[PDB]
Design a binder for this molecule. Structure first.
Ligand SMILES: [Mg+2]
Lengths: 190, 8
C-alpha cells in the first residue's frame, strides 16, 4: 500500500506538535530514513497544501485521510523554518520500503528478581521527549495495566511488586506531552 | 493517551 514515508502531527483541535506548540498547523514529524521523503522533507516542516487541497485550518483526521487517499505523486507546499520559507515539493508514494523504526528502540530486561525488573531502552534523540511512560500488565490475562513515568533524560526504569513466575507485557512510550510518539515499544517477560 | 503523529 503506497506510502509517503513520513508522519504528521497537529491540526485544528488536534494534539499539538513539538515544533511550534502554539501552532495548530500540520507538521512533518518523523521521516523514514530510506523512504520517498527523506531527501526532501524535514521534521518541523509545516504542510500548507497537498495536491491543491489547503492544509491550513485542517483537522488531523482529514489531513491523514487526504494524504492516504492521494494518487502516487503528491505535490506539497510546505513552510520551512529567522526565518520562514515556502517550498513546493514532489514526493512519490512507495510500495515499497520499510517497517518504521520503534520509539524508543531496543527495549530489554537487563536484571531481574522474582518480583522486580530493571529494563532499559535506547534514548530517543530525534525529537523532544518530556518523559517516558512505562506500562506493564499480565499478558492476555484478566489484569489491568499498570503504569508510571521517568524523566525524558532517563533510559532505564525499575518495575517492582510483580507476582513471581507470571508473563507480563511491558510497553515504553516516549511522550512529548500527554500524548506520545508513534511506534511505542513492547516486550513480554516471565 | 494516543499517538501525536500518524504515518502517511
Ligand atoms: Mg533489580
Amino acid at each position: 500500500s503506497p506510502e509517503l514515508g513520513f508522519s504528521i502531527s497537529g491540526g485544528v483541535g488536534g494534539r499539538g506538535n513539538p515544533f511550534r506548540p502554539d501552532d495548530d498547523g500540520i507538521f512533518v514529524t518523523r521521516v523514514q530514513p530510506e523512504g520517498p521523503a527523506s531527501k526532501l522533507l524535514q521534521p518541523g516542516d509545516k504542510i500548507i497544501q497537498a495536491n491543491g487541497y489547503s492544509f491550513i485550518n485542517i483537522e488531523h483526521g482529514q489531513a491523514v485521510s487526504l494524504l492516504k487517499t492521494f494518487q502516487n505523486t503528491v505535490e506539497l507546499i510546505i513552510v520551512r523554518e529567522g526565518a520562514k520559507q515556502e517550498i513546493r515539493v514532489r514526493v512519490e508514494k512507495d510500495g515499497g520500503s520499510g517497517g518504521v523504526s520503534s520509539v524508543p528502540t531496543n527495549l530489554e530486561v537487563v536484571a531481574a528478581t522474582p518480583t522486580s525488573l530493571l529494563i532499559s531502552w535506547d534514548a530517543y534523540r530525534e525529537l523532544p521527549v518530556s518523559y517516558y511512560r512505562i506500562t506493564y500488565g499480565e499478558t492476555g490475562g484478566n489484569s489491568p495495566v499498570q503504569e508510571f513515568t521517568v524523566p525524558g533524560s532517563k533510559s532505564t526504569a525499575t518495575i517492582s511488586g510483580l507476582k513471581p513466575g507470571v508473563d507480563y507485557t511491558i510497553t515504553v512510550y516516549a511522550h512529548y506531552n500527554y500524548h506520545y510518539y508513534s511506534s511505542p515499544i513492547s516486550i513480554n517477560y516471565r | 493517551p494516543q499517538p501525536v503523529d500518524s504515518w502517511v
